[PDB]
Amino acid sequence: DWEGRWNHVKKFLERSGPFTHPDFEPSTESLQFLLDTCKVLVIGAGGLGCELLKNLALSGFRQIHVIDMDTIDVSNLNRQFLFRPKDIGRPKAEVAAEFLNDRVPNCNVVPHFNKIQDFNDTFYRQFHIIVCGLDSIIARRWINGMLISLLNYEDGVLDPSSIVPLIDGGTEGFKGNARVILPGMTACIECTLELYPPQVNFPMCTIASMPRLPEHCIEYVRMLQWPKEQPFGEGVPLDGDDPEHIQWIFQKSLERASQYNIRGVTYRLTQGVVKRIIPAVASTNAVIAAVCATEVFKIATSAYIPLNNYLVFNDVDGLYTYTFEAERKENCPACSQLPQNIQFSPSAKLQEVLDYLTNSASLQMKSPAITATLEGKNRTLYLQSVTSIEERTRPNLSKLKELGLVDGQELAVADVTTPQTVLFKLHFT
Amino acid sequence: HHHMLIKVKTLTGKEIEIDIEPTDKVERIKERVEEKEGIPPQQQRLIYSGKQMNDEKTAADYKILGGSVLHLVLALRGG
């Protein structure tokens, strides 16, 4: 470290001041303590990712990790600034840590070319703070669950040292948001799950044969006409990245559109509709990643009171931000302690339970698996993930009393949205 | 009867006034916003005193009184 290097960080550690967190102790060895020993995990080396990595490195963090499973695409280049075009086809984490470690001296960015699923709790337990700039909802749901599962409750009460602060940024056009989550203390991802906009999807009948919009034509080709005609070889899935596949859908959508008299099918709309593409610029990403970074710094250093929860940002019409404290849900299926309460007739089928699990706007599971202790062994009522078992059990979708379940019994639910076993308590009626 | 004048701040900071009653379901508040501003109710997410306002519950059980300010809010999927 050279003369002056950290002069922009030092004032907030060495000096006291009226607006500090009540735990703040001014010292000339807080900085070195941070650089040396504060382990921080960044999740995603994308738009938000790159910016977080920059922000932490220049903020006095040094023991930084990154996870990203994706590879470098040409379209990343308008914002994912750690990648140059000669890097296309390389793993983001690799390139991102390579860039950072050269640009910011002594930085110890450690790349993990990995899915977040690849890791289990042993791994995540080691970090002091986890910041993520993730892609979608489902993965935010996963990491939320993983950090909650790390929590140790000793007979009803919570060991605070087992909390791993989670900072989540998300971004979409010129709108963006940032969260500070304290698993088991403040509102988690799932507590505020209904905050995401509707993931607009079309009635299969409109796609089937009632299009009114160009998007419907491309969707027709996507889920219907591609399986029907298997044009790039039978048993070859639609690859959204491949320029030939996209070309095929595009022409095949101009046909369908011209038939029903629909102007609007472009190569850009096709590529959008298929990949469900989020419009992205660097400026919005920067804004959000900065907020998150500021908060990581605040939590790790106690230099100020962390953001109490939530911030929304909008750039379209002037500049607007709203900050608030999201209330924790007492009933939350993720972060609350005691099992869910579900009420069914003893002559409810089991399909009925699954339908409840899939559709409930508070549960929103996508491919759940139900398990209960019937007789001696744990018994798998129904599982979806391994087709071996989604066949040995398929019959069971007809009964609950016929299955052997009693009022009061708890069922173990598992789903891809989370590594946790969600517990439901059954009540007959 | 009650004639409560609440305000709603949109995602751009635009503030709008709405006349409601304590019995009015959250559903209807969203319809009042749509009527002035064209924001489809399905896209609306209302926040008052930290609480995410359920369509089916009412104004009363969020303790929303006279000059109260509701805030439309969003959660963004991409990164």
Add this chain to the structure above:
Amino acid sequence: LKEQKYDRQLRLWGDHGQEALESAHVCLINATATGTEILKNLVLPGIGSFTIIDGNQVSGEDAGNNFFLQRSSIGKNRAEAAMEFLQELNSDVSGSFVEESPENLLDNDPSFFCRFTVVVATQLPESTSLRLADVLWNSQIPLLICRTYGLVGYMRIIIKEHPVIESHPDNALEDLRLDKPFPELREHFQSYDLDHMEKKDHSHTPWIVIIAKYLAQWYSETNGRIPKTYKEKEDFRDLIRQGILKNENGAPEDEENFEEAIKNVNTALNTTQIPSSIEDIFNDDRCINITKQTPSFWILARALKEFVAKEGQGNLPVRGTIPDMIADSGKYIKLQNVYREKAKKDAAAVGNHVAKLLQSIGQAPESISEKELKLLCSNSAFLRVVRCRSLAEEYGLDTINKDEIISSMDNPDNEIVLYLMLRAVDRFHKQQGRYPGVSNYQVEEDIGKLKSCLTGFLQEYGLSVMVKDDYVHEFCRYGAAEPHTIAAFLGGAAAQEVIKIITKQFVIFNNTYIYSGMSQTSATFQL
């Protein structure tokens, strides 16, 4: 042609915006952390070219908080160093630098600034700020002053007048005109007979038609006004509810087209209005009084006012778009085209009022294209004009917005306080030749000295607001620091205002933004 590279943003401001962007030239003053973060966010999307004026050497601490300076830069010129790194971001972007300082520039080559689309000055002291803003105001060059000071982030925009057509509103009420239908629409409606329809043909009629049909029946059955109070629109929903065709057994069917119509009674009896925003535009001296100098925007503004008197019976052109509904292809498409064509016809009608003013203006009637006229007709409800007070106005003893400051100080922790502290800090600087509490040696007595400066500032402008002493303490704490993450935030916020100016798309903020890294709260003021 790799336009795959800009895909994600092309989806926001389009090809026409992207072109505007790729032919702009932006000047940055001071290549500090704030400076290069703003600049990083313009190079990435592919700003045409850039010039960094900066007359400083890279300090030790400069290399500490900047992603675009290195340990090796220490000693070298800040502008030149920053540019070498920023250019590596995007090889479609042309960089430049000038080793002369801002003050030096203004003394020897003020006209230098007439080559830029936008000037973005960062971290300027009070005097330089005031000299620059003045020159550029009279030179009519768009200025953006940005500043990171401790956890406080601040930016002032200054464009005398910035008129925008394509304002990209997140939401708006649809232009359906059911309340005042155009002749070509009434034709399409009467080609629909509800009672005498087939099976599927009933459950596939677009809800707009449906509401129209029943709006006739109501207008008939009331011999007078249409439904206006909430009690009335409820009954109208019920009258619609009747039309749902029952079956053999006796139960109403699940015709969603009718359910949608029932839902949309909320909006689609709008009353077709001229937004009072557009009212203000029409009544503006620059629309009323066409001259030969008048710019392209105000021509078109008048070509709409004149349409409001003549062809429009008192209203704006038809938008020509319709929301998606429940309907079969043909019935939707045919309905879409009745809307589409009327617009394509109201545009061509405005395009005639275009030439009729270009006669008085004495210019060829094809200078404004049919690609420009579409956008203006589409967005006839969405036009905005942002005008900015000059800095001299803000800083004037007899022109300061006391009302705005005092009003906002009601909450003693309102963002405005951070601005007042900035103004205190700035006069601290010019009294002292240095910022407060920079050195640990100086923090103690500077709290004293800074309060005194604040007192004097508030006295000069006759401002009787009270500032918590914790702010004086905290601003000394800062010691003119420029924390990266504060400056990153400004970098994003600012960069996109500059992109707004360049593309003339979206709406610029009006005047003064204040971001507070402490509370993670922000606010806009019109100072």
